[PDB]
Amino acid sequence: ATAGTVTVNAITSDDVINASEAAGTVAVSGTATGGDIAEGDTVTLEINGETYTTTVDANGEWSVDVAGSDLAADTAFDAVVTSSDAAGNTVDTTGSSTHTVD
């Protein structure tokens, strides 16, 4: 099983978490493609010690709802996609993100 490419979009438009964003939920999104990545593979994000999870869609994208306060307290995290091949062998593909907090 072969690793793909996981990327993480900007954390909101400007890649900054402001006080008003910190108050609620923030959709964190990105892409997962290439290698053996496929639809329904899990994407796992640890943000401020909290584990946030979603799955890959048919177009190689993902989106998860994160508490904005977790984002205000953690300025960097990896998104990790777990894939397998036809024989069952698994692989992890990691993408990284930073953002800033105002």
Using CB under 5 A, list all residues that contact Ca ion. 12, 14-16, 74, 76-77, 99, 102
AA identity, residue 74: D
Nearer to Ca ion, 12 or 33 (CB): 12
Q: Which residue is nearest to Ca ion (CB)?
A: 12
Q: Is 15 annotated as a binding residue?
A: yes
**To the nearest whole angstrom, how small is the minimum distance from the Cβ of residue 38 to Ca ion?**
25
Residue closer to Ca ion, measured from CB, 93 or 99 = 99
Instruction: Please give the C-alpha separations between residue 98 and each of 47, 79, 85, 88, 91, in angstroms, as whole numbers.
Output: 11, 11, 30, 32, 24
The verdict on whether residue 30 carries a ligand-binding annotation is no
State yes or no: 92 annotated in a binding site. no
Give dist(CA 43, CA 63) in Å, integer: 9
Distance CA(52)–CA(97), nearest Å, equals: 14
Using alpha carbons, select from 2, 7, 10, 64 the residue that is nearest to residue 32.
Answer: 7
Nearer to Ca ion, 76 or 87 (CB): 76
Binding residues for Ca(2+): 12, 14-16, 21, 49, 74, 76, 84, 98, 102
